[PDB]
Structures are given as structure tokens and as C-alpha cells.
């Protein structure tokens, strides 16, 4: 049977999701997460759907940027696979929690 080589479908997906703009995290789970965190901060809070959407936009944008910088960190260590070490480095240089 047919089979693509490891890495090809990956690049394919990179191009695909770099062409589009839709949110990549599922909506309802994200809403659950937000409501959980918020509830832990303050009880009986209600959200405008707009607020949830804004939160998701900001979140995924942030994660994509962080993934870019992380990828640069992986490439810097003569690697191709990104690692927790890479993310921690990117976070430190950014100054998020150095």
C-alpha cells in the first residue's frame, strides 16, 4: 500500500494552516477552560460569547508566536524537533517568566 515519508505530511500541514485563519483549538472545550479559570477567580460569572472569542483569538495568536520563536530555538540547537527546553528558552528571552 501507499505511504508518505515522515516529514512530508508535516510540511503539507504547515502550508495548509499557514494559508488559513480559522481557530485551531476546539470552541466548546476552550469555553469550558475559560469558565473554569474564571470561576476559580470569581463565582457566578457570565461571559459574552464575544469575550470568549476574543480570549481564544488572543490565546491562539500567542501560542502560534511562541511556537515560531520555539521553532527558531530548536533550529538554533541544530535540531528540527521542538522540545520543552526550547519553549522554556523562548519564554526566558521574551521575559515571560525568566
Amino acid at each position: 500500500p501507499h505511504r508518505y515519508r515522515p516529514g512530508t505530511v508535516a510540511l503539507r500541514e504547515i502550508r495548509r494552516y499557514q494559508k488559513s485563519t480559522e481557530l485551531l483549538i476546539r470552541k466548546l472545550p476552550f469555553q469550558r477552560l475559560v469558565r473554569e479559570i474564571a470561576q476559580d477567580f470569581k463565582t457566578d460569572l457570565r461571559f459574552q460569547s464575544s469575550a470568549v472569542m476574543a480570549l481564544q483569538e488572543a490565546c491562539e495568536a500567542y501560542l502560534v508566536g511562541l511556537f515560531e520563536d520555539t521553532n527558531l530555538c530548536a533550529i538554533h540547537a541544530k535540531r528540527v524537533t521542538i522540545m520543552p527546553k526550547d519553549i522554556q528558552l523562548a519564554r526566558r528571552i521574551r521575559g515571560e517568566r525568566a
Partner: protein, 105 residues
């Protein structure tokens, strides 16, 4: 009666900009030329972005500008990218870019 926008030859609302200046507590007094100047600058920047975005929309064969076109416009222009370095455009996405080392050998 003439609007100050027409007198200044602007599309952007001079009067509104002036009111926002006074009702924003930036200073107790506001000059007569400040809202005109500011409205002119905002109108110009709006014009530039709408231009580049319009081009990006023509490139992708679309009559209507969407946030994607705005994102392409901002990020492909150096100066607009710098002016909006710490800004996120909703539904914008990113520039198509793959690190060369990742490409098939």
C-alpha cells in the same frame, strides 16, 4: 455652515477628534490645529492600510477586504509591521513562511 473637515479638506471628522481630545483629559486646553493635524494623520494611515490591503485583496481575487488581507498588508509592509509589532489582528493568521532547514533534502 461648513464642517471643519471640509475646510481642512479631510474625510476624517475634525470635530469628533477635537471632542475626543477634550474628553480624554490629555490637556486642559486644546489648540485649533491639533484636531485637524491629528485627523489628517489618522486619515493618512487609514488610507495607506486600505491601499495595501486592497492590493492584497486583488491578489487573492476578492472584491471585499477581510481581516486576512489586512494582516498580509501589515506584515508584508515593513513600516506598518513595525507600527503594529505588538498588535494582534483577529482572524488575521500569519505570513506563509517555512524555515529553510525544514525543507526536504
Amino acid at each position: 455652515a461648513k464642517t471643519r473637515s471640509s475646510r481642512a479638506g479631510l474625510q476624517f471628522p475634525v470635530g469628533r477628534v477635537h471632542r475626543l481630545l477634550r474628553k480624554g483629559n490629555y490637556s486642559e486646553r486644546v489648540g485649533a490645529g491639533a484636531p485637524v493635524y491629528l485627523a489628517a494623520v489618522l486619515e493618512y494611515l487609514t488610507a495607506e492600510i486600505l491601499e495595501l490591503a486592497g492590493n492584497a485583496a486583488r491578489d487573492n481575487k476578492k472584491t471585499r477586504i477581510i481581516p486576512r488581507h489586512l494582516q498580509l498588508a501589515i506584515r508584508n509592509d515593513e513600516e506598518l509591521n513595525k507600527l503594529l509589532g505588538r498588535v494582534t489582528i483577529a482572524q488575521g493568521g500569519v505570513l506563509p513562511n517555512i524555515q529553510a532547514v525544514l525543507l526536504p533534502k
